[PDB]
Amino acid sequence: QKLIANQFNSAIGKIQDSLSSTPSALGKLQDVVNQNAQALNTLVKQLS
Amino acid sequence: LVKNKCVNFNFNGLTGTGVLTESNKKFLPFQQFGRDIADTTDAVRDPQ
């Protein structure tokens, strides 16, 4: 039990640093946000 | 001069509708009127 708890705590602590250091981890949400923003920008630019 | 009220404006060569108020994004001496994304007018300096 103690070893498993230590392993779980270590993994939970490490995943925070894994998310922070890696820049492309959060891509799948920034992707759709940027896609919608780009579509809106292309729409508004069509006025001129 | 009219401020903080939905009015129609006709400045030097540019015409549009919308409320106009004092802001903080100061202009350089050569500048005449500001702009933002999609080439839409959103800031005009007072000729007076």
Place this chain on the structure above:
Amino acid sequence: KNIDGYFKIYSKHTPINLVRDLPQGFSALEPLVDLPIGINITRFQTLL
């Protein structure tokens, strides 16, 4: 520049401290005067 019957003149004072007269760069040009005369030009000559 000579476009649409205009003679736009842009100038900028820039101190230098390197051996080369032209520095590395990172400089822009701010408009100073405007001259709206329509005259076709094909050559220019300096004055000393």
